[PDB]
Design a protein around this ligand. Structure first.
Ligand SMILES: *[C@@H]1O[C@H](CO)[C@@H](O[C@@H]2O[C@H](CO)[C@@H](O)[C@H](O)[C@H]2NC(C)=O)[C@H](O)[C@H]1NC(C)=O
Ligand SMILES: *[C@@H]1O[C@H](CO)[C@@H](O[C@@H]2O[C@H](CO)[C@@H](O)[C@H](O)[C@H]2NC(C)=O)[C@H](O)[C@H]1NC(C)=O
Ligand SMILES: *[C@@H]1O[C@H](CO)[C@@H](O[C@@H]2O[C@H](CO)[C@@H](O)[C@H](O)[C@H]2NC(C)=O)[C@H](O)[C@H]1NC(C)=O
Ligand code: NAG
Ligand code: NAG
Ligand code: NAG
Ligand code: NAG
Ligand code: NAG
Ligand code: NAG
Ligand code: CL
Lengths: 322, 11, 171, 322, 171, 171, 322, 11, 11
């Protein structure tokens, strides 16, 4: 008569690493590293992303005519730029503090596009019909949907002064541009004053702009430039535009709401009818495990990104069926 | 989390 | 192992014990079979459940973390920002891989300890009424029926009750 | 006859957590986490803080009349701003590189306020008596104690040129402002030149300022602006002021000494007769333990801040009195 | 425990032993009482003193660390600076909580080991002059007075001196 | 040690055993000498080799890392950049010193375990054909020549072959 | 007859620390901390550093005459500035975005110095022979080797317009300066126009420069200033210079190649005939161990820097020869 | 630091 | 890496 003390074995082929020994086959184990994704862009906590299509941030804000227009009001959980954004700034020049604007838009949850300065009504005695071939649409020369190229009318450019009081109860994002012609002949033919200036003020913003005429190497077949500027007009505050030339005026502006947990990602994937708590540029992860090796960029509630190929904890025993 | 490896283990 | 039992003086495990991590196999006249020691199995599960949950709990949820952009005159800021992303990633890759190795070592040793503790718990119950025939088994110097085997398993073995018969067979 | 081997138990109810088991009662233990503070602002290694009262940094440097004046020389271990600093910049405008100045003042240990440009003596043929209602004091219109609003006198504003050579043997912090009127009428009535300019130079500093006239939305009932500027004049170096209008001149400046371990905190607490080696915005900690969960902001020799609610090391045994 | 002693085959501790962590209780004709084994207690204290001091020593003093400010056009720099504060705090909260758990485990196991080492040190001194009556006690096959008990406690027990008397009572 | 052997009931080590970490010394009529147990030595080396290599492997190569410069109006950026350099250095100094302490503890305990496992492996082979004379030695109740000693060393000791002679000398 | 089980001892005096006990003598051990260096500047993976001699970065780029000239083409693995760089900017003024240029040069592997604007050929009707005593060489007044002080000729300064098209197939680094005289008399005597301007454009760069006349405290015996500017002209792009005064023109520019793993260090050591995989400002390390305590600045494949004085892992046993 | 839990412990 | 402390150890 005999009794024996022993331990469990089974048919598991799980392996784990330890300090003293690699590749130990064990009976029961737990994986801590998520490495799978679904290849799709998904809703995040029920809210769809803002997909910019053929545009980048700059092209959507300025109103590039090549990009399909969006509904006047959008809400989103994160913004998706495509890697091959061909449509952005179409008239060459510099977007000032562009990178800080992106960072601001990373915490915006919603916009409402609205006509801040109605076209035929805000700049009397000035031409508003200017277009260019650098910003073409359906072959024809066109212009930014959100801005307006004000030019001379009947051989004069009178000094203008317009202003907007923000009663939207949310920050308003105002964008404008400043044109720089390549020679003083075109400066006269367009704004009739060689010593033009533009002035833009709010309670807290204060900047003045001067034409800088010089020949420049052609970009998109243009020897002049157009710089672009922006400010966030606080609720109740007033923005005043004053100029006697060279101003690319605001026509449409954005009332903005703030949010949490949003972001901008660049992604090759497509939107699908799916929902997730965690989004990467490659696809959505479910978020039960503590680590993930799929992407360092994440939106939402996500595991922590690590370079590991394997993170497996043993729970059972050294498996010896011999 | 639970390690329910056998049913008599509890939850 | 550190405690000599698993893969030690108990060379292998039992595919036949399907209801627990630690247990017993017996052989008497009424028959033979396996039975697992639930009290030690449930202790081990409770400890490893806590170990696994603590490993997950120390890792906070990772909220949104996306890149920034920089212009051509902000390289130093872009390199600082890259240094911060790489540095935190270096550290968390290291922390995760090391914590799992270190806990895997201790988890195997914890099992090895539990087996041996059970073996010594049985050995001290039987004393000289049986003999260690190696490999983690005992041979009784007396007849041990199912009721006797059950008394060893649940820690109530009656040493005097069989001491005489054992002394005789031991001679 | 018997002997037994055993272990200690006692009446301790200390609990600790381990990896395999939570909440184990043990006989002897050590706490590593300090969680207590005294609620007071204290001296730090024997040196009192600099409390700015109703002012913020900007209001103390410019000489805001609402804030009680300080002794002409102060030494401190850290600077305390109150959360509800109502007195700061009283004439609206922008403080240029304000944030970098704060960072500089975070390593200053001492100041000596001194008259760099005596009032009635440095700007002959100019009026120095200008005041404003935005900077009121006891109801009457007033002005910054450290600056001086130079205006036209007897219908002229002559070009001025003054300079100061730093023989203090320490960095001197010079502050000045530039006024921006809302219309060219007030620009003429105050400085008599529509094309005014201000020039400020040292060995290493070089900046020129131009009035920018435009109507602006009223702030503190003012449609014009006043920008504020500063530089750190090195020992032995000379700062030259040259202007024919619009200059808000320095009258008082600060000789500065550098120190170590100082800081700026925002705090609701009061100064008491107490001393500490570690200060937080909530109160002073003693600094024996390696971790603290009281505040992430610390001055002095402090434990390391952690989010933990409990850090208790067991030294004794599993406590089993049964 | 890992070594089977504390809360194991020695079910509980002694409120009565007030002068040390590890020790003895004896019962002979002259009386009974507790006495602690100072040599093993002092070793344990020395080790745990070093463990605690090393934990404090690896943590450098935290010198001054205050926030910075940023203007409305420096959000990216403000978010980088926030990312650096949170990242270091994430890591140090994790390091501290984990180090204490891991050391608490090893500290309990270290005690459990010390008890068992003492038990086996006594068992090997007595050999068959006494019998293990479980629960960490021995019953002498001979008379053991205070001088004899003191010889067991300080590691100088004379096995031949009582071997005859023990053989007789053992029979 | 945690397992009681090294510096425990085996007070010291053998300068005389020059061919391994763990082994044997024997004394019979044909002579005396030392011989190391290669199977346990090679296991230990394999484990510690892996431990050391894993410690080196978790540490990635450090690629180029040089300072940046800042002008007199970029102090906040210079202090952030200094905070990032110091923070990562604080953490890696801490990680390195702690990992080595923790592994040094476990490495000594791993040796102590290996010695004891070998001792118990021998003890269970001999059973009552020999007697534990303390200090990690056994005295045979029979004559054990070189062929017999070699059978103990390589785990093939024949207990019945000497059981009679041992019973007699044991009496 | 007896057999004994035991363990190894030997004559090793290695000590290690553990958690429970410090200073344990053991039989076998491994050192993980490299603390030795060779005191030399070495080649890195076979490629020599670029040693700037008596110059700093600024002095080599501008062509300071005191520094020995380099071969027209250099390739390097890292750049070495000496701590006591006496030769840098010799004509006082500000180097704009100097720190960002250093950062750019930290990933450059090679330069080719070339005459972008040949001296006697690019600025007809202007004097090119201007020199100064602040930039002296062999006692005589001199000037930057890479720039050219254009002045008035025969009492006129005609408007110039020159340009360079980059066919080097690599980024070209163009540097220029702008002079600021202390008084309008010298502005006339040198450039004959008080309202001078300089314009510099490429496809993507756009900046305009204006003389700012003011008396300044003398530096290196100069009351005027010279600011210095740069841009990276992309392959195929054109840079246009236009000015009617005050321009310190480019003469030589740098075609640049990018590389990996390079850096700038400041070092007191000398170049030797040696090769390494890891370089510090104190000397070369070999890179077998995982940690080093020699310097936080490293170039190449290096151990990780730590503050530790000792990192020793035990492999053998507690060594007890007693 | 000292763990002076009993007086005979040393400092 | 190898711990070749004795020649019979293997590599
Ligand atoms: C880790 O261990 C596993 C288990 O032994 C190895 O996988 C086995 O390899 C052998 C040899 O080819 C095969 O006969 C078995 O069928 C494999 N098992 C399974 C489940 O496929 C594995 O090769 C080991 N890896 C390393 C790197 O050591
Ligand atoms: C942790 O353990 C302690 C000690 O057992 C628990 O506190 C005891 O809880 C019981 C049940 O309410 C009371 O009867 C005792 O009086 C408590 N002890 C003391 C000193 O107050 C505690 O509840 C446990 N906590 C957790 C989360 O398990
Ligand atoms: C660490 O341990 C070593 C080894 O015991 C100590 O070095 C010995 O110190 C004694 C006392 O001076 C000398 O007699 C020996 O000759 C030393 N050994 C050697 C190899 O030099 C050392 O002092 C200890 N250090 C600490 C801080 O405890
Ligand atoms: C183990 O065996 C069971 C059959 O009882 C089977 O269902 C299971 O898939 C097997 N596991 C593996 C990993 O093959
Ligand atoms: C998505 O974008 C990547 C660029 O990172 C590209 O290499 C990849 O081919 C794209 N996917 C497909 C399906 O083309
Ligand atoms: C333990 O008992 C003592 C009495 O000897 C008492 O002074 C002490 O306060 C008690 N400890 C606790 C935690 O109650
Ligand atoms: C101190 O300031 C905080 C603001 O962070 C405020 O909420 C708190 O109420 C203040 N303390 C008192 C006593 O009012
Ligand atoms: C140990 O002894 C050997 C002689 O066999 C000698 O060569 C070696 O240098 C000694 N080691 C030390 C550290 O002294
Ligand atoms: C090298 O430079 C350092 C400055 O950090 C200086 O202290 C040191 O003396 C120099 N070396 C020599 C040999 O002079
Ligand atoms: Cl451990």
């Amino acid at each position: 008569d005999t009794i024996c003390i022993g331990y469990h074995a089974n048919n598991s082929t799980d392996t784990v690493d330890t300090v003293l020994e690699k590749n130990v086959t064990v009976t029961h184990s737990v994986n801590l590293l998520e490495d799978s994704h679904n290849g799709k862009l998904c809703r995040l906590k029920g809210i769809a992303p803002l997909q910019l299509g053929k545009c980048n941030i700059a092209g959507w804000l300025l109103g590039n005519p090549e990009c399909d227009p969006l509904l006047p009001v959008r809400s989103w959980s994160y913004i998706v730029e495509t890697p091959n954004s061909e449509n952005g700034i179409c008239y060459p020049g510099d977007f000032i503090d562009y990178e800080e604007l992106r960072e601001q838009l990373s915490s915006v949850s919603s916009f409402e596009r609205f006509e801040i300065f109605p076209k035929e009504s805000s700049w009397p005695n000035h031409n508003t019909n200017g277009v260019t071939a650098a910003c073409s649409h359906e072959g024809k020369s066109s212009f930014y949907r959100n801005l307006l190229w004000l030019t001379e009318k009947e051989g004069s450019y009178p000094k203008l002064k317009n202003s907007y009081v923000n009663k939207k109860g949310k920050e308003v994002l105002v964008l404008w541009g400043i044109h720089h012609p390549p020679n003083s002949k075109e400066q006269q033919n367009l704004y009739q004053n060689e010593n033009a200036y533009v002035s833009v003020v709010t309670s807290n913003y204060n900047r003045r702009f001067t034409p800088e005429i010089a020949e420049r190497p052609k970009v998109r077949d243009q020897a002049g430039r157009m710089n672009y500027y922006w400010t966030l007009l606080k609720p109740g505050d007033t923005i005043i535009f004053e100029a006697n030339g060279n101003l690319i005026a605001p026509m449409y502006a954005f009332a903005l709401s703030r949010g949490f947990g949003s972001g901008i990602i660049t992604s090759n994937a497509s939107m699908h009818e799916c929902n997730t708590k965690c989004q990467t540029p490659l696809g959505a992860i479910n978020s039960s495990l503590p680590y993930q090796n799929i992407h360092p960029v994440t939106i939402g509630e996500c595991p922590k990104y690590v370079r590991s190929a394997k993170l497996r904890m043993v729970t059972g025993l050294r498996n010896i069926p011999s | 989390x639970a390690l329910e490896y056998f049913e008599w283990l509890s939850a | 192992g550190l405690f000599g039992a698993i893969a030690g003086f108990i060379e292998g495990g039992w595919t036949g014990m399907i209801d627990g991590w630690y247990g017993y196999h017996h052989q008497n006249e009424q028959g033979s079979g396996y039975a697992a020691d639930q009290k030690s199995t449930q202790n081990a599960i409770n400890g490893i459940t806590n170990k696994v949950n603590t490993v997950i709990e120390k890792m906070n949820i990772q909220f949104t973390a996306v890149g920034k952009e920089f212009n051509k005159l902000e390289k130093r800021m872009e390199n600082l920002n890259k240094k911060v992303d790489d540095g935190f990633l270096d550290i968390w890759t290291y922390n995760a891989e090391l914590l799992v190795l270190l806990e895997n070592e201790r988890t195997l040793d914890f099992h090895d300890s539990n087996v041996k503790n059970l073996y010594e718990k049985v050995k001290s119950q039987l004393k000289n009424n049986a003999k260690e025939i190696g490999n983690g088994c005992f041979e009784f110097y007396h007849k041990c029926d199912n009721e006797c085997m059950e008394s060893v398993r649940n820690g109530t073995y009656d040493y005097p009750k069989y001491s005489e018969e054992s002394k005789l067979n031991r001679e």
